C-alpha cells in the first residue's frame, strides 16, 4: 500500500496539527501519520498553557510585558544554552500563534486569568478551557476534519526515504504489521515529540538520571523522529539535558496539575515545617531542592483564597479524588490540622506561615524572594499535598534553523525535511520554562507546514 501527498506530517500533537492545518491552508494535500491509536501526544495530557508577551488577556488584566523580557526570561532559564534566534522567533510569533488558535482553530482561553510559571518575570501564560490540552486537541481534530486533513492512526513512521540528491521524498511506516509508503512531493515534517518515555535513550544520554519512577508521560514519546533523522545524517544537540517536573505524585511520578496553585501563592513546606526554595524558581532548581529535603519530598499548601483565583482543585477533580483516597492530599479547616495530617511540627509550620503572611502584606519575601509575591494563608480551609520530583521532559533533539529546516552534521539543510516541536533541541537550553513548550510547538509547527507547502514539487 502507498499514498502520495504534498506534505507528510509525522505526529498528531500540537506541532503536527499546526503544520497540517497550515499545509492545507496553502492549498496543498497533506496527511498526519500517528503511531498510537489515538491522537494528541504529550500536547493532550499537558496543562497546555501557552506563554505570550503582549496578549489580549494581558491587556484585559492590565499586565505589562515585552518581547525583550520574555526572550530574556527564556534564555536565562536555560542557562543561555538555547539558540537565541530560535527563542527570538518563538517570542516574535507567539501573539500570532495564540490568536490563530483562538480565531482559526476556535480554542477557548480564559479571558481574565494567566499563569506565571517558574522562571517568568510576569504572568504571561494563556489558559485553555479546562486547564489541559483536551480542549486544544479536540478543537484541532474538529478543524482537521472540517478542512479534509486525514489522520492515519496506528501508523508508525520507521524510515525516511531519501533520493540520490539527498532530498527527503517520503516515509515508510508500519501499519498492522505491513509497510506503507508515503510519498511526500513537497516535504516531510517530523513532529514526533520528545523521548522521555524511551527508558533506554534516557540511560544512554544521561546515565545519572533519577530512576525512582518509570515514565508517566505519553507512551509515544520515544525518540523515533531523532533516530530516523540521524540515520540520514541529521544533527542532534543537547541530548543529555533531561528535566524533572518538581511536583509529582510520590507513588507514580505523574505530574500533579492540581498543584498549579503554586503559580498563585501556594507554598512548598518540608517535613520540618519550613520553606526551603522559591516557589517560582526554575523546575531544575526546585527539583534539586526538594530532593535535598527530608525524605526527598515536599508538601504543597494552599487555601480557599488561592483556589478562588486559581481554580486548580475545581479543574482537576480526578487528581483530587485519587490523591485523597491514597492519603497523599487532605482538605482541612486549620493550619494545625494541616500539620497534624502529615506529621509536620505544629509550632514550626505556624511560625513559617506567620512569616508568609507578613511577606505577603509587604510584598517582600525575605526568605526566598518570591518573584510575584506571597499570598496570605491565615484563613482556611486548606489543601495540603505530598509531592516529589520526577523525570518528564527532554531538552535535546534535532537541529533545525528558524525556518524548521533540518540540518545535517555540517550544518547544511537536508532538502525536503522539516521538524517542529518537542522533537527539536534548540529552544529550551538546559531547562525548559513552563508554558514555553506550547509556544514553541505552535509557532514552529505553523512554520514547518508553511515551509513544507512552499517547497518545490519533487519531479
Ligand atoms: N514513529 C512515529 N510515527 C508516528 N507518530 C509518532 C512516532 N513517534 C511519535 N509519534 C507521535 O508524535 C506525537 C507527538 O506529539 P507530542 O508529544 O504532543 O509532541 P509536540 O508537543 O512536539 O507536538 C505523539 O502523538 C506520538 O505518538
Ligand atoms: Cl514588546
Ligand atoms: Cl514551572
Ligand atoms: Cl547534552
Ligand atoms: Cl484530574
Ligand atoms: Cl512542559
Numbering used by the authors: 0, 130 to 587
Pull text from the paper.
In addition, we obtained a structure of UrdA′ with an ADP instead of FAD. Notably, this structure does not include any bound ligand, even though the sample was supplemented with urocanate (hereafter called apo-ADP). In the apo-ADP structure, an unambiguous density was present for ADP. In addition, density that could be best accommodated by a glycerol molecule was observed in the expected urocanate binding site. The closed conformation of the apo-ADP structure implies that the urocanate cannot be bound when ADP occupies the FAD-binding site, which was supported by the ADP-induced inhibition of UrdA′ activity. Phe243 is now positioned in the same manner as in the apo-ADP structure.
Interestingly, the fecal microbiota of type 2 diabetes patients has an increased capacity to produce imidazole propionate (ImP), which is catalyzed by the bacterial enzyme urocanate reductase (UrdA). The X-ray structure revealed that UrdA′ adopts a two-domain overall structure (FAD domain and clamp domain) connected by a hinge region (identified using the DynDom server).
